[PDB]
Amino acid sequence: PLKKVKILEQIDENWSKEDLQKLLKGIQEFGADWYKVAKNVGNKSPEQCILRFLQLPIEDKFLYGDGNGLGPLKYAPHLPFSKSENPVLSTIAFLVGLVNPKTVQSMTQRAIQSAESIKSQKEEISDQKPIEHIKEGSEIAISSLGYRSHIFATNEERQMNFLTNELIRL
Amino acid sequence: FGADWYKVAKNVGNKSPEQCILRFLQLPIEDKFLYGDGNGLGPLKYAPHLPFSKSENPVLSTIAFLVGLVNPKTVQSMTQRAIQSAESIKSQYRSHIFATNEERQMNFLTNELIRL
Amino acid sequence: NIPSLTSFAEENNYQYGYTYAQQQLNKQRQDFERVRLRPEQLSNIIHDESDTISFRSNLLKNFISSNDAFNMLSLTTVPCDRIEKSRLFSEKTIRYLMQKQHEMKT
Amino acid sequence: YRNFMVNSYRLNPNEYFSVTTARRNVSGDAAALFRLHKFLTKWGLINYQVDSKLLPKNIEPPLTSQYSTRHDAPRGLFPFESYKPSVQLPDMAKLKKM
Amino acid sequence: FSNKEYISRLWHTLKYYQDLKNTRMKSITSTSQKIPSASIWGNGYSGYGNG
């Protein structure tokens, strides 16, 4: 019962209204360079800006706090009670930090799109379980991987066309 | 008697030793201590052969652990929406590769010189 | 030699049981069809490309070719706006099609 | 007919159970009894141990013997594995919690 | 379960099968010298019907 408000205000842990405004300015102006977005906010990391843009928490333990829907993730080792490394969340942030955030706003309805659309999205993502955030973030990460794979496929097709023209000239 | 099935079927009575061996095989002894009922166990399903590294390929191991949770239909929907949104941005025959008017005329020149 | 077609008949040949002309023709038959139908006990046992194909070498090459092409996909942290496109023509194919198009009016 | 022939052979397996005694002891035509006897002796089951011989002696090399199996041997097949216990202190805490 | 153990397992598996092949060759050369030794597989038949 308090895990719900815990994740609801752990997404919004230390992000004020002004940090959100500078974040959205850096997101809508600059494209796919999160370092300048973090410098536009100033006192945050690019990974933290990505995870707040996706409306995700950090530290990886407020998600899957126990350990049944998480199959093998219970059996993962960790550093206990200290030295928080977040393999799931940094994997998700690394995969979403490559894929042109305006089309990420086009990809899902959950992501932050404007300064007028924070409150309604924050209300509509409420009353969710901690497994739901893992599910949605991993879906976004795998879809961004598929999009990047499509771009690499089109570049390899361009390479095959170049080799075809070389064959014809030879 | 350890595994002498004739003495075992003698002790049981009224049953052939093959039924004793078969019912000893089909007992669910350790199934209530394993993980699943029948989502998935993930890479732990491939137990003695694990070709993944924490140090070399850190994305692939986390993705191997993560693909069990997600639904594939929504993943396909989101990546096709990303592809169509990228096409809607880029638009603003193989014209996806040959986007410039220069390279289309170069390809037509190639076909012309081949035919000539 | 080159014995007959009558020597190949079932009447002049042995069967599962349970003269002189026959025993003379079956000498030439077994001396002709054992120097003709005998297999080659030497090299050129490759016969083609798809018999000396190696499953282990191809499996190893595919294990390498999947691993490095997946490290090309995920671990290359270049954004999608920054992936520069390759040229659809070369530095020599662009010269030959300037030459032949100059020489196309003959 | 089949149970008669098989029961009659197995009283004295050293004797070749001929067709003629089977023909003389059950009533039927000689062709069908001959065909059934030849089918039966084709598949073993009768006249399989008429002239039996003794295997003399086996000078057994090591690992080709009964009870010639070791725990140190590789399980190529026998797919069940024996796994190494990982004793790491954070993993000890994880095992205590789980 | 790391690399340095997974190759040491394969060294303690190949060296088994090399001794197994030495046994297999010795049990062939024994029967070729008209001495009836047993093989890796069992002795096939007996004098019963089949040879």
Partner: peptide, 20 residues
């Protein structure tokens, strides 16, 4: 490698499964 994320070590994920 620092900008790359960290990964779940599978070789210890199996061991605390069989040991559990």
């Amino acid at each position: 490698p620092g900008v790359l994320p960290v990964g779940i070590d599978t070789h210890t994920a199996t061991d605390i499964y069989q040991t559990l």
